[PDB]
């Protein structure tokens, strides 16, 4: 059975493959993540926002525990996003518990999880409904400090490819594999979760591939006729035209606009003419995955090709250990930044 | 050439899901708001009628018959078509103080809800606004819709003129463009209005689309024409006042406007005016047509904040949404930012 599609480790680099190695997440304390909702709990509402700090367990696990403690169905507990199990993460959970009474969540004890705050909120917390995350990482046993230092400087200026991290395609890549097999047939998928995982890996893999192809051009950030340019910090995007190229390039160079790559699916991809031809050619061989996404009615969307870590700063503890801090928008991965610093 | 409707910039970005709007007339309920209660005296009789399956003019002629008066004695502030359910007000001139029994007036598909005398005649465009109740069906991405409804509560939507403004098949804009290329006058007065209206509306939509491409959409600039919320009055922003003006705009007390090109001054000045002119610089022919026909330039809020926006999800693929919009604003403009339709 001949397999596929550019593999993750073969994805193009913006600053070239690093000339050094290092350790990522040697200890959970070396990977701290603080969720950034973008809003404060209202202080009223039928929902209860619970801010927790965890270590050594996934979000759903703590969510199920929270549900049990409040004597409510696991379905009554949601969250903004999945936080790494092997790391120190802080995030919000949301449980629907209507009423004027506020349950004593300070009694909720669970190994590898500390409650830090809880208050009522009107609307339920939905997946993907967060602003971003603040990261504090420590890279250990850095074999080439000068290479890493130089890369951190270049990242501050040019950024890094906004790839979906390896964690997006399932353990061992099962999600992408399963998505591929399912696309080779017409056998519908029962399990709602198994279906979402697969559809997500498919579109994510295609996005990464389009970006990897675009990075093979002479000028990676060159705006071309028909590009879908997204305003920095938000979803709104528009189509570029030959007539406006000069001014558009300036905004893109100034990081006001973001060249985007397609997130394949039903409907139109967004790009037009030249740019559209490019994206279609970049994944021309993936007719099967493309067709799968279309039949499952997963609307095509736009995603920034590049990623500019915010408030990027770093400190070297010694010639082989660095602490790095930065904030990333929702949907971007810290591993996409680290990929351009060291090889793991 | 000119930005096409479907390519008009989105405030919240193009939706990542689809759905059905107005599957049946019952999924689109529009309740007219006069902006006042009838005087309860006067030579005119205001009649509120629930309409489903026929248009205004039709019901108006039917009322005229029932009351034994000239069809042109029945007026109305806003026209509406069959495809939607509308609680509309009709105005009949019946001098005197006696109140005819509008309980015998039974037209197919209609229902008289109330009636009272009033002093002034009801005129087209005199409506203050409309309250809508819509049912979006076969929603493919609830999460997307939910977040967009929430974002709209905070930021609103672009106050675009809906497609209906450009005639069936876009014929009104087409007619305006063909007309703009010749000095030939236009016979039919109805054609004149529809065409001039489509041209100015298209220009406004393009200016807003351009403005939405800026880093900060609601950023006030020197020379901007700011309109007081709820009314037509507007004034020009000045550099020395920006911080204060910006606060009132963020607080939704003032509305940044975009031009409705026509004869006379557009309203904006300096920077803002230069921006608006460039935004439609290539539309010289349509502009000259408006100037030529003496259609006075005017102002229209760039953004639209649906009032009392609330919604209820029947199931994962069905939502009933309610909101009030001032006259001149479109429900389709709110929906454009929620789902993609065909």
Protein model, in words:
By secondary structure, chain A is an alpha+beta fold. Chain A has 2 domains: 7-170 and 307-344, 2-Layer Sandwich (Pseudouridine synthase); 171-306, TruD, insertion domain (Pseudouridine synthase). Chain A is built from 8 helices and 14 strands. The first copy, chain A, has helices at residues 59-69, 145-158, 174-183, 192-214, 245-253, 273-282, 287-295, 334-338, and strands at 31-36, 47-55, 77-79, 88-96, 113-121, 132-140, 160-161, 228-231, 237-239, 257-263, 301-304, 306-307, 310-318, 321-329. In chain A, the strands form 3 sheets. In chain A, strands 1, 2, 3, 4, 5, 6, 13 and 14 form an 8-stranded mixed sheet that branches. Chain A has a 4-stranded antiparallel sheet with strand order 9-8-10-11. A two-stranded antiparallel sheet of chain A has the order 7-12. Chain A is globular, with a radius of gyration of 21 Å. Chain A binds chain B through residues 123, 126-129, 230-232, 234-239, 256, 266-267, 270, 297, 299, 301-302, and chain B through 7, 9-18, 140-141, 143, 146-147, 150, 212-213, 215, 340. Chain A: This is tRNA pseudouridine synthase D. Chain A: One of its GO terms (biological process) is tRNA pseudouridine synthesis. Chain A: It comes from Escherichia coli (strain K12). Chain A: Substrate binds at residues 31, 133, 333. Chain A: GO terms for molecular function: pseudouridine synthase activity; RNA binding; tRNA pseudouridine synthase activity; tRNA pseudouridine(13) synthase activity.
